[PDB]
Amino acid sequence: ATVLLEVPFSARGDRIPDAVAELRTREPIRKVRTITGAEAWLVSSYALCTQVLEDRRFSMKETAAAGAPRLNALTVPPEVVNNMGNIADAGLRKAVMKAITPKAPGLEQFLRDTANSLLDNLITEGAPADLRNDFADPLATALHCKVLGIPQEDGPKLFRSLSIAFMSSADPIPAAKINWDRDIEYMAGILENPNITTGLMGELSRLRKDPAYSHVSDELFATIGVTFFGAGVISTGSFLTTALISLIQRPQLRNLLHEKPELIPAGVEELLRINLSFADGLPRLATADIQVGDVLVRKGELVLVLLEGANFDPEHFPNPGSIELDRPNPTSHLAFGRGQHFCPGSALGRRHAQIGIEALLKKMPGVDLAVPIDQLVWRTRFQRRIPERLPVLW
């Protein structure tokens, strides 16, 4: 005898476990146990994944209900699991979206300049360099301080909350509350700071004083700042880092994108498709009894949407493990989710990767890992898959 299959299978972000393809072929929805001891339904085919994500009766918000089967412990207040809902209800969705587009004036040039500066600093210091801690993460942090309108010097201290805030823990985390409360107090100060007049925080600070938003809570405005900084920085930093590993281990691609950088957007889209950055399925709570494949999911049950299950499905993406720049369905992957909760930062995330990769390939065309790949240390019990260091030479 053995215990029910447990998730996640592996914290390694450089290879997909063979088990995923066996699950998808034999039982594309099947029961698993999460780190809390709860049972869940693990969905691993493209067809089923999309079904769940496009059916709002599979609820994000209700994942936070008391007594529900849980993937992990909350690290935020329960109302924040409905953060986009709350933003929408307060009439802030359009404003938020306008603030976090990469099309803002000078923002792409800021990204380019910062990428180049970080890489020049590595080149000056000499190999080996750490491309996570000294490239991808500072580039993500700088980008988000600019997007928010907050001082660049405040980036590092906000960033130091993230190794805890994005944990995927069986139990509540005392440090996550200490850092949340501190970060909310910082964003509440920024809304009262007259020097802050640009970016998402400058726009929220104006809307706060506009009569049409007078009944929006000060808690919501501060929470938008904290959440969009942390979600953006973790997601862009982790995605770039793991895409950089995928590129380093494909020199033929690395060399084609060096030689024809116009193919960088198509390459980033494929890097998005194969990316293993999300460590867990996306959770949803069934709010009705709903047939999914061969399983009738019951009201109150937890469903986990495995992005890599969808994104490696050979029925949808033939030769799924290959990076193919000419696919007919290139953006139809689920790297940014699907449906009501589709990533609001998708365009920003794509541009951060594109510019980071362009900059790196121009400055370090001979980039390679400086350790054998098996020596990378994968962060455990986290909402992302990430190596703790990414040592490279060039």
Ligand code: HEM
């Ligand atoms: C490559 C970069 C990124 C990836 C791969 C990514 C991926 C995702 C995915 C998969 C979801 C859907 C979660 C779900 O349905 O349960 C999502 C949601 C979210 N993303 Fe991103 N994201 C990235 C960048 C960003 C950026 C740059 C921001 C903000 C500056 C951001 C903010 C958020 C927020 C706030 C949500 C929650 C939306 C909701 O609840 O409706 N993301 N992201």
Ligand SMILES: Nc1n[nH]c(-c2ccc(O)cc2O)c1-c1ccc(O)cc1
């Ligand atoms: N899923 C999450 N885990 N941790 C967070 C989070 C974000 C910022 C932060 O400072 C603390 C966090 O716990 C989130 C979060 C939750 C909702 C949201 O719209 C964006 C991010």
Ligand SMILES: Nc1n[nH]c(-c2ccc(O)cc2O)c1-c1ccc(O)cc1
């Ligand atoms: N308001 C709630 N408090 N706790 C729950 C809950 C959720 C899932 C479960 O399996 C058991 C519960 O009591 C709910 C809830 C919320 C929505 C729903 O469709 C079913 C139950």
